[PDB]
Design a protein around this ligand. Sequence first.
Ligand SMILES: *CCS(=O)(=O)c1c(F)c(F)c(S(N)(=O)=O)c(F)c1N[C@H]1CC/C=C/CCCCCCC1
Ligand SMILES: *CCS(=O)(=O)c1c(F)c(F)c(S(N)(=O)=O)c(F)c1N[C@H]1CC/C=C\CCCCCCC1
Ligand SMILES: [Zn+2]
Ligand SMILES: [Zn+2]
Lengths: 240, 240
Amino acid sequence: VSPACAGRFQSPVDIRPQLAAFSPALRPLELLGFQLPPLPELRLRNNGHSVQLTLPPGLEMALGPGREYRALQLHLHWGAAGRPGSEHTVEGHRFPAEIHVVHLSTAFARVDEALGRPGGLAVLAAFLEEGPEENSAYEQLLSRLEEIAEEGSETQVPGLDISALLPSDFSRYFQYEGSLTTPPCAQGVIWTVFQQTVMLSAKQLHTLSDTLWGPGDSRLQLNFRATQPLNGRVIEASFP
Amino acid sequence: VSPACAGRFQSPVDIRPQLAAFSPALRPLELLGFQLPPLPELRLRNNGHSVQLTLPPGLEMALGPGREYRALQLHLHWGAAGRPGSEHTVEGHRFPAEIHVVHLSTAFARVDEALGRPGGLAVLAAFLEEGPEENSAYEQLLSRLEEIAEEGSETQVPGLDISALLPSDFSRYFQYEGSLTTPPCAQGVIWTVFQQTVMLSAKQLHTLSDTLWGPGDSRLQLNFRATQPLNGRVIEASFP
Ligand SMILES: *CCS(=O)(=O)c1c(F)c(F)c(S(N)(=O)=O)c(F)c1N[C@H]1CC/C=C/CCCCCCC1
Ligand SMILES: *CCS(=O)(=O)c1c(F)c(F)c(S(N)(=O)=O)c(F)c1N[C@H]1CC/C=C\CCCCCCC1
Ligand SMILES: [Zn+2]
Ligand SMILES: [Zn+2]
């Protein structure tokens, strides 16, 4: 086991908005370069614990003036038939699924220099819920999961608008300091959890939860870590 | 000439409390191990642009949960005969002088790794003003300046309570991210500026501004940088 998985300031956490602190210094997130051309293609991989999409160079995210990041990859967390699988919770509610987009501070050339360093890594997190319509951005990934059902498999996909996998509201979010939710669980990670959720169809949510296989001959499902105590940290909110 | 000195997020800045963002997540500063015994003695030095006191290991400081620092050094910025020389200003007001205690993040083993990295270095800053009483804490430093009037000269001084040099209420400060105010003007420095001031007698302030010599045969005076634009940065405050 990696010892940082036992740190005091771990993720995910249960967001209790009434205890969140309004902080008007938290401005709208800004993204640049997220609208990709179809070529070159990206690699979508079933890594045994999630489905990840590796992102190319040139995707820039800023948490505010002088707080600049480059996107590395995104992956998903989900549950199973009639069971939610988001990592973060709100007032103890778990949502069907969750997208994470992991970024590296521009002060660091590599992930290993950033790990455990304050603000070295930043993750954008949005909850996924059921809506009435097929989400066409998600469909480009979801329609390829069958190709990568086996653990350790991967496939190429056309570039797409990565910002279309996220909510349109970039103004309203919680932010706190926490950890990777997978070994080595390094601290210093800045988590931004959007208020607005993204909508997938029931069929889409069922494809995500029901298509991939993990270690052993088990279905890759319920791939979320248990909620961690805040242990005195204060979640901030960009809105009162 | 250090082109970093023309970066976008430099220090110092003009503080405008009405435009500061209050965040209740900014808790009282924690400063442990600052009460130094008389021995060992500390190196106090005139380096030509300020007077510096090197600090030993063991001075621990936190800006928040798991955001910890170790104090390296303190130095001062001052004016001249009836001219103020603080670096930060408040609504255009320049104070007689300012003390800076520079710290290294415990997430970085070396200063040279911390330079340019967000939160790698953190400085505590306090304004010094004129009051009627002589300040015991500052007298320990000021009474020793005549011995190091010459550029490059140094002397050993007894250990003292460094925290006694700082204002009364550790609950009440401004905070923003900026730069060193001297070459190399590295960015990613977290500045914390106490709201309340510290008082020295007119004699002490004169002793500070009038005893040290700089490059050539000029007086070491007005050792402060002009204020820099915020460029969209919002100064935070720890009180409504
Ligand atoms: C186990 C690999 S993973 O799927 O891609 C993964 C993950 F489950 C996960 F939960 C997180 S989290 N929730 O955002 O903390 C990830 F960050 C993640 N992948 C990262 C890899 C783990 C850190 C080691 C760094 C080496 C690889 C560089 C990419 C960083 C993404
Ligand atoms: C010119 C050296 S100094 O006198 O001691 C000095 C200084 F003027 C100054 F304005 C700053 S500031 N206001 O805090 O930006 C300093 F930090 C300062 N410090 C010297 C040593 C500080 C220890 C680690 C920082 C390393 C940066 C390299 C410059 C050396 C500055
Ligand atoms: Zn994740
Ligand atoms: Zn200084």
